């Protein structure tokens, strides 16, 4: 998911939570968000 824009990544994160996607998938997104130093958006 390295090629997703910051915008689409964050959008995907909130959409994953609404659908109650796998906690493991949500964690993968969160880790990517953390890697990009964008946790302040969460």
């Amino acid at each position: 998911m390295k090629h997703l824009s910051d915008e689409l990544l964050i959008e995907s994160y909130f959409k994953a939570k609404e659908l109650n996607l796998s906690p493991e998938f949500i964690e993968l997104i969160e880790k990517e968000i953390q890697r990009r130093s964008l946790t302040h958006k969460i």
Binding site: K15, A16, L28
Partner: protein, 217 residues
């Protein structure tokens, strides 16, 4: 100038589940972009990429593995190589690779599936090093009391830095298609068979992998 080397990864479930987790999530997100075809397409592309990652891991780890514990066996090296060659034969075509097999039916002790996996990983690397034409040489002989299997290619080769890192978990130069786990299992399998391995390579010229195994009666 040529060079030579003489010789933590995740569990298999973690290695395969990681990309399948990502694929599952992005597949499910597709319907969450009903107005943006480009975002739906990006999700689908990522999912497919992750599925291809899973397939690469399966290739490196599980090409021959059967759902039963293996037992050590007297393996006909000529027959085992020929079957691996037959499997990689379509891959040699399309990439214009000429396979030259000079083999001898010597025996070694090992586990058939793992030994085939080891051979596949080495030979697949050799073919992938020759994307637009080359020659693959497989040679069986006795080298000072032990069975020698050497696998030579006329491919891209490796620098000294790359060669010293060959077999390090996750070290790859192949981008998204790389795992960096294929050679790592080669080492582990050879060690378990009480063997040794040498890799000589020179950038732009090619690579020779030499596998030394104890001779069985």
């Amino acid at each position: 100038g040529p060079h030579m080397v003489i010789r933590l990864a995740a569990s298999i479930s973690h290695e395969i589940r990681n990309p399948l987790t990502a694929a599952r999530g992005f597949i499910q997100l597709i319907e969450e972009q009903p107005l943006a075809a480009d975002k739906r397409r990006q999700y689908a592309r990522i999912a497919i990429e992750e599925l291809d990652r899973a397939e690469a891991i399966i290739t490196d780890y599980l090409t021959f593995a059967k759902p039963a514990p293996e037992t050590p066996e007297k393996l006909n090296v000529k027959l085992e190589i020929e079957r691996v060659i037959d499997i990689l034969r379509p891959l040699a075509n399309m990439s214009c690779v000429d396979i030259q097999a000079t083999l001898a039916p010597f025996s070694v002790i090992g586990e058939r599936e793992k030994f085939r996996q080891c051979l596949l990983n080495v030979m697949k690397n050799a073919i992938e090093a020759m994307p637009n034409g080359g020659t693959l040489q497989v040679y069986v002989s006795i080298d000072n009391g032990r069975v020698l299997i050497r696998i030579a290619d006329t491919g891209v080769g490796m620098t000294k830095e790359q060669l010293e890192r060959l077999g390090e978990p996750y070290f790859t130069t192949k981008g998204v298609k790389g795992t960096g786990l294929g050679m790592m299992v080669v080492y582990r399998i050879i060690e378990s068979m009480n063997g040794t391995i040498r890799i000589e390579s020179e950038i732009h010229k090619g690579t020779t992998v030499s596998i030394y195994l104890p001779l069985a009666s």
